[PDB]
Amino acid sequence: GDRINTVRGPITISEAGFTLTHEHICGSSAGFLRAWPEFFGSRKALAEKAVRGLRRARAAGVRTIVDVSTFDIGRDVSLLAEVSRAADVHIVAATGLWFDPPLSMRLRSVEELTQFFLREIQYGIEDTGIRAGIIKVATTGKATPFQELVLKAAARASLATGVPVTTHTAASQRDGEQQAAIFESEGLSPSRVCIGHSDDTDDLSYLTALAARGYLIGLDGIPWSAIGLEDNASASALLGIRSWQTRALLIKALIDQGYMKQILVSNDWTFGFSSYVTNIMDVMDRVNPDGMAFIPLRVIPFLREKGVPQETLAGITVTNPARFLSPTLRA
Amino acid sequence: DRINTVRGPITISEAGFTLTHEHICGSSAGFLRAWPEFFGSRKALAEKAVRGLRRARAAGVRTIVDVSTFDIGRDVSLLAEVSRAADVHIVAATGLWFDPPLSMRLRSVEELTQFFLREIQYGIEDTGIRAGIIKVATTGKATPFQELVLKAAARASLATGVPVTTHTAASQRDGEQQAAIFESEGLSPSRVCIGHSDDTDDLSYLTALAARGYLIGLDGIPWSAIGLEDNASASALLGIRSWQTRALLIKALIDQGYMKQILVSNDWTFGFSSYVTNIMDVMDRVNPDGMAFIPLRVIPFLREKGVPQETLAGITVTNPARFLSPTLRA
Numbered sequence: 001g002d003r004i005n006t007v008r009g010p011i012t013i014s015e016a017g018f019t020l021t022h023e024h025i026c027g028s029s030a031g032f033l034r035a036w037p038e039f040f041g042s043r044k045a046l047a048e049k050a051v052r053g054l055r056r057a058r059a060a061g062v063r064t065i066v067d068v069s070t071f072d073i074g075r076d077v078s079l080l081a082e083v084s085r086a087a088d089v090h091i092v093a094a095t096g097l098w099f100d101p102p103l104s105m106r107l108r109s110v111e112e113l114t115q116f117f118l119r120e121i122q123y124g125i126e127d128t129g130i131r132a133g134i135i136k137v138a139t140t141g142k143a144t145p146f147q148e149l150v151l152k153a154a155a156r157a158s159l160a161t162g163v164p165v166t167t168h169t170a171a172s173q174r175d176g177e178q179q180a181a182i183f184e185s186e187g188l189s190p191s192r193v194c195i196g197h198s199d200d201t202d203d204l205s206y207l208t209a210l211a212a213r214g215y216l217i218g219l220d221g222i223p224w225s226a227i228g229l230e231d232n233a234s235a236s237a238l239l240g241i242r243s244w245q246t247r248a249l250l251i252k253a254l255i256d257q258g259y260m261k262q263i264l265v266s267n268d269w270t271f272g273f274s275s276y277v278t279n280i281m282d283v284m285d286r287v288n289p290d291g292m293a294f295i296p297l298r299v300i301p302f303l304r305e306k307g308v309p310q311e312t313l314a315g316i317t318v319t320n321p322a323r324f325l326s327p328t329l330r331a
Numbered sequence: 332d333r334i335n336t337v338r339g340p341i342t343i344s345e346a347g348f349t350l351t352h353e354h355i356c357g358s359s360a361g362f363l364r365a366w367p368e369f370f371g372s373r374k375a376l377a378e379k380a381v382r383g384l385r386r387a388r389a390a391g392v393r394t395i396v397d398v399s400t401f402d403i404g405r406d407v408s409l410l411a412e413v414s415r416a417a418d419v420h421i422v423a424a425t426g427l428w429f430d431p432p433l434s435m436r437l438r439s440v441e442e443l444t445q446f447f448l449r450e451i452q453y454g455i456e457d458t459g460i461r462a463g464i465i466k467v468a469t470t471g472k473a474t475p476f477q478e479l480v481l482k483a484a485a486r487a488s489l490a491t492g493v494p495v496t497t498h499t500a501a502s503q504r505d506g507e508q509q510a511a512i513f514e515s516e517g518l519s520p521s522r523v524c525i526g527h528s529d530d531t532d533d534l535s536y537l538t539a540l541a542a543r544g545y546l547i548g549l550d551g552i553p554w555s556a557i558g559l560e561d562n563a564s565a566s567a568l569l570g571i572r573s574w575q576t577r578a579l580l581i582k583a584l585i586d587q588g589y590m591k592q593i594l595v596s597n598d599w600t601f602g603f604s605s606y607v608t609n610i611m612d613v614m615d616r617v618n619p620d621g622m623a624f625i626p627l628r629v630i631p632f633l634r635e636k637g638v639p640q641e642t643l644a645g646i647t648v649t650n651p652a653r654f655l656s657p658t659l660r661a
């Protein structure tokens with residue numbers, strides 16, 4: 001509750017500083033990176049790409065990033081540790097399950113999944129001794145039975161460890177509502193959960209409803225936009241057609257209603273991406289050359305130029321993250 | 332002339348008694364490294380594997396083909412380690428089964444071709460261990476992805492000479508569509524083994540494929556839920572046909588003159604996480620002999636039913652060697 005686990009070890013709350021709460025070094029699949037490294041050029045190249053990108057964010061002031069890649073996202077902790085050490089940026093690793101779990105998981109029970117999540121947070125990931133500092137879960141519209149189980153196990157592990165929960169939603173379908181439901185049914189405090197991909201909807205009504213209950217709202221895909229790239233059906237399907245300004249304004253909307261303490265902002269960027277069409281990255285890097293630095297460089301000043309006081313900006317990027325990430329046990 | 336094993340190349344003559352469809356562990360990609368305790372421990376699994384392989388060895392088995400693909404959680408390093416301890420040759424595989432992740436499902440036929448060749452020519456992961464066979468699958472009518480897979484499989488095979496082995500839903504006659512696709516890519520049937528064939532009682536479906544030149548895989552002989560019907564999961568997986576019935580299919584094809592087209596295995600495993608928890612315990616109760624089941628029980632049974640030893644020797648020694656030998660097209 002005093003220290004936060006990173007792939008380099010524990011750090012104190014003050015050490016975290018400017019923190020990006022939903023990012024990825026690589027978006028892939030379990031075992032993929034070890035089996036076919038050439039799909040990304042080479043492991044060495046994915047790594048140099050990541051270090052450069054991370055150095056750039058650090059220059060703009062980023063000190064910590066939370067890589068929310070789960071086992072099924074193809075998380076490679078060794079990879080995380082190596083770029084973390086090289087770029088000198090702290091990286092928080094995750095446990096949980098995304099939406100592409102293999103058979104060996106789909107068949108597990110809630111109790112077995114609970115153990116698995118606990119193993120990762122308390123014992124370490126694989127045989128590295130590296131501990132996860134966050135649990136990631138997801139739904140794609142109406143939850144599946146399996147998904148239901150996932151949410152429950154995430155809640156149990158969190159209750160037992162004090163580590164927070166972060167989710168992937170289909171904002172459009174108001175997933176957040178169903179997720180809150182399950183978590184509360186487990187006794188988990190909304191203050192330990194972040195409902196992500198929220199900037200993906202314009203429904204301010206949905207957002208404040210959640211904000212109002214004590215949840216954290218993740219506005220994490222700021223730079224995601226296929227505007228001008230309407231040519232590409234695939235890019236458009238992923239990126240959406242709302243501009244980044246539209247997304248950034250939600251941030252101001254929430255502040256305005258008085259929810260500055262429940263806002264978490266991120267880019268949801270990546271340096272590699274195998275779980276999608278081939279060459280989607282190329283397209284992405286074209287739309288956002290700034291990568292992870294996009295927030296500090298572009299969103300921050302923009303929000304400033306619109307009436308938001310710097311100090312408020314500092315609380316959303318430093319203060320909220322710290323409070324969220326510190327392991328906290330229920331009274 | 333030389334077959335690729337997890338310990339290196341071997342000459343055809345060293346293969347000897349070969350079991351063509353087995354598994355050291357039946358899991359998922361990354362699973363064993365992430366949650367070894369699910370199996371007791373990695374060390375425990377390994378030790379179990381070494382034991383049962385030494386027993387099979389005792390009985391005469393010299394080589395085993397582990398048909399575990401990437402998505403089956405194949406761990407080449409585990410394989411090498413137990414091959415070394417037991418002193419049994421193990422042949423590894425490339426290909427895809429029916430649980431591919433997004434990263435795989437989204438690739439093109441050309442991409443898939445590359446991955447399979449990589450595993451066969453360059454090696455598995457970073458180990459340098461080369462695959463000696465390609466495993467594919469269908470579970471009834473092929474999906475479009477599955478179609479691509481079968482195509483890339485056929486292509487990798489043509490370029491390398493390495494045989495192809497498949498999983499099928501025998502009862503749905505999957506073999507027929509697989510052949511159609513394979514033939515369309517130019518692949519010769521003699522390079523292909525249509526697996527799980529013992530899962531059907533339809534002799535006509537089997538003789539037709541044999542006639543065309545395919546190898547028939549009669550590989551789940553010991554799989555039977557007979558007396559375990561109180562267990563639905565178990566029964567769903569093992570079936571309720573007895574081991575004798577499966578074995579007889581072997582005699583049935585010999586009798587039709589296709590002994591040269593027959594391949595026999597157990598489809599056994601020492602670890603199994605892609606199923607209900609505790610299935611292994613059920614399985615080990617059903618077949619204490621493990622992989623030695625073939626030699627200790629099927630051979631003697633067949634001999635007793637009138638099959639000449641020598642014929643038996645052709646099936647377990649000669650057929651595999653021919654199948655396994657990397658064969659290029661004319």
Ligand SMILES: CCOP(=O)(Cc1ccc(C)cc1)OCC
Nearest residue numbers: 115116118119120122123124368
């Ligand atoms: C064997 C995996 O460890 P374990 O069962 C018990 C365990 C937890 C933490 C440490 C430091 C050692 C051992 O993990 C807890 C869920």
Ligand SMILES: CCOP(=O)(Cc1ccc(C)cc1)OCC
Nearest residue numbers: 038445446448449450452453454
């Ligand atoms: C995986 C990178 O190697 P490669 O492109 C070419 C390659 C094949 C074999 C050997 C021994 C070295 C290199 O793999 C074959 C498709």
Ligand SMILES: CC(C)OP(C)(=O)OC(C)C
Nearest residue numbers: 024027028073168275276
């Ligand atoms: C793959 C897409 C469709 O979903 P997402 C945005 O959670 O992917 C992660 C890996 C960024």
Ligand SMILES: CC(C)OP(C)(=O)OC(C)C
Nearest residue numbers: 354357358403498605606
């Ligand atoms: C339902 C699945 C588990 O069938 P199968 C027989 O191909 O599994 C292998 C890994 C033994």
Ligand SMILES: [Zn+2]
Nearest residue numbers: 167168169197
């Ligand atoms: Zn997501």
Ligand SMILES: [Zn+2]
Nearest residue numbers: 023024068268
């Ligand atoms: Zn993400």
Ligand SMILES: [Zn+2]
Nearest residue numbers: 497498499527
């Ligand atoms: Zn099979």
Ligand SMILES: [Zn+2]
Nearest residue numbers: 353354398598
């Ligand atoms: Zn099998």
